[PDB]
Amino acid sequence: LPEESLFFRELVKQWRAQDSYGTWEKKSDMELLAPYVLDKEQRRAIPIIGDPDPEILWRVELFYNAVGLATERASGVMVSPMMKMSHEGFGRMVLIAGRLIVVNKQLRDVHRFGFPSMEKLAEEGDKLVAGALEMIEKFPEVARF
């Protein structure tokens, strides 16, 4: 159930935290996160010209923030992102626990960031948390350094 994903709950919480004035308080959690969703073909048609819109960069940042906070909830180890955009839709995102890189991602075509359904959004976030947990388990002294 999407609403029972640790990642999903952390993503809802990330967006509620940005809403300082409670402007979206009447929106359901699913409406709040609906911008992460768009069907395959529409998303693949989006060009890669210049820098992605800042709105897209916020979505990506908060998405990885949510992976980090879900990983901490499942492990007790703090996990924080560091993103560095390169030339255009290219960049790098790492998630760091202590001195351990628990998620490493070379980002491309960032303008097209999105998922075909809310269920798929949750599933992909969950996969990232699973990978991060696997790394912390293999190298716990580095994760807690």
78 binds a copy of itself, rule: CB under 8 A: no
Rounded to 5°, the CA angle 7-31-91 comes to: 50
Annotate each residue in 102-131 with x if it binds a copy of itself (CB under 8 A) or - if it does not, as one string: x-x---------------------------
- Work out whether 44 is an interface residue with a copy of itself (CB under 8 A): no
Q: What DSSP letter does each residue of the chain carry, written as one string?
A: -GGG-HHHHHHHHHHHHH-TT-TTTTS-HHHHHGGGB--HHHHHH----SSPPHHHHHHHHHHHHHHHHHHHHHHS---EEEEEE-SSS-EEEEEEETTEEEEEEEE--GGG--BSSHHHHHHHHHHHHHHHHHHHHH-HHHHT-
Cβ proximity to a copy of itself: between 28 and 104 the closer is 104
| Contact code string over 81-100 relative to a copy of itself, x by CB under 8 A | -xxx-------x-x-x--xx
Asked whether 112 and 76 are in contact (CB, 8 A), the reply is no
Is 57 a binding residue for a copy of itself by CB under 8 A? The answer is no
- At its nearest, how many Å lie between a copy of itself and the CB of residue 138? 8
74 near a copy of itself, judged by CB under 8 A: no
Residue (2 or 91) nearer to a copy of itself, CB: 91
Q: How many residues bind a copy of itself (CB under 8 A)?
A: 15
Site residues (vs a copy of itself, CB under 8 A): 82-84, 92, 94, 96, 99-102, 104, 135, 139, 141-142
